[PDB]
Amino acid sequence: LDFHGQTVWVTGAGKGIGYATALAFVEAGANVTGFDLAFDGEGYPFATEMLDVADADQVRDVCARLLNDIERLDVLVNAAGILRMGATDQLSAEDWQQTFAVNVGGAFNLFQQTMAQFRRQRGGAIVTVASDAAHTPRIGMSAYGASKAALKSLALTVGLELAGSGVRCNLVSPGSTDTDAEQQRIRGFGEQFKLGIPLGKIARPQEIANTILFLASSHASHITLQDIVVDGGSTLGA
Numbered sequence: 260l261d262f263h264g265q266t267v268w269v270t271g272a273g274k275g276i277g278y279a280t281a282l283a284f285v286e287a288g289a290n291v292t293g294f295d296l297a298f299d300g301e302g303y304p305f306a307t308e309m310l311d312v313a314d315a316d317q318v319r320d321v322c323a324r325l326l327n328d329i330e331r332l333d334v335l336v337n338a339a340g341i342l343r344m345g346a347t348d349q350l351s352a353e354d355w356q357q358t359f360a361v362n363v364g365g366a367f368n369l370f371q372q373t374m375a376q377f378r379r380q381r382g383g384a385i386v387t388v389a390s391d392a393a394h395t396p397r398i399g400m401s402a403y404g405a406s407k408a409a410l411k412s413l414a415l416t417v418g419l420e421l422a423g424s425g426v427r428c429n430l431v432s433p434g435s436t437d438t439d440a441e442q443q444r445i446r447g448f449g450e451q452f453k454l455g456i457p458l459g460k461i462a463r464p465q466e467i468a469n470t471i472l473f474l475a476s477s478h479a480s481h482i483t484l485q486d487i488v489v490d491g492g493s494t495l496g497a
């Protein structure tokens with residue numbers, strides 16, 4: 260897949276799926292910018308911008324600065340996110356608040372600062388990383404799952420608001436990804452009503468990034484408001 264000369268922004272580019280996706284876009288020929296709280300590696304094969312996606316003021320300021328000098332923003336990938344686990348009645352006030360500020364507020368702030376640009380240029384692609392936990396309830400992850408369901412609903416409504424402008428807006432919802440507990444995930448936990456993984460393996464970040472590239476590409480030129488679950492079948496299609 261080819262992205263030569265296209266401007267691509269990826270949040271959460273510091274590691275995990277965000278890094279793998281920013282890298283895949285580089286290897287597809289794009290001009291990439293990764294945004295993240297921290298870039299603790301010694302080097303990155305793309306340009307980097309310190310950014311707390313939950314700080315609405317910092318997002319405004321960075322997006323304004325960068326949009327001053329780019330003609331066109333071909334692809335925005337929302338991949339920043341955190342996981343805070345706990346039973347619903349034991350989750351701390353702080354874990355609830357930052358779960359939502361980061362996992363939903365982050366994309367909301369990016370949308371508030373970039374939608375005008377997508378409207379102006381009359382096209383582009385957005386891809387937002389949700390989670391399998393937005394598709395199915397997960398013991399221990401009520402807050403995380405709900406924050407990713409909010410994210411999914413947000414990105415689909417944004418996609419409907421920008422469809423008039425020719426923008427495609429989609430999601431990828433990863434299951435367990437590598438970022439003997441692995442063989443027990445694959446088998447499943449019947450006791451917590453969490454199915455194993457029929458494909459008999461967990462995901463590699465590249466397999467999430469590859470799906471994001473497809474959805475951001477012109478091969479997906481008629482695909483909008485879709486959410487591809489990448490999880491070896493663990494949710495059984497739900």
Ligand SMILES: NC(=O)c1ccc[n+]([C@@H]2O[C@H](COP(=O)([O-])OP(=O)(O)OC[C@H]3O[C@@H](n4cnc5c(N)ncnc54)[C@H](O)[C@@H]3O)[C@@H](O)[C@H]2O)c1
Pocket residue numbers: 270271272273274275276277294295296297310311312313337338339340341342361365388389390391392432433434435436437438
């Ligand atoms: N790993 C899995 O199995 C899995 C499953 C479902 C969903 N996901 C989702 O995939 C995406 C990437 O997750 P990962 O597994 O690569 O996680 P990770 O923790 O390895 O990396 C996520 C990155 O997000 C960045 N980030 C966190 N808070 C931020 C903030 N406020 N502002 C800017 N950047 C911030 C972190 O600094 C980190 O670099 C996330 O959206 C995550 O929720 C992952």
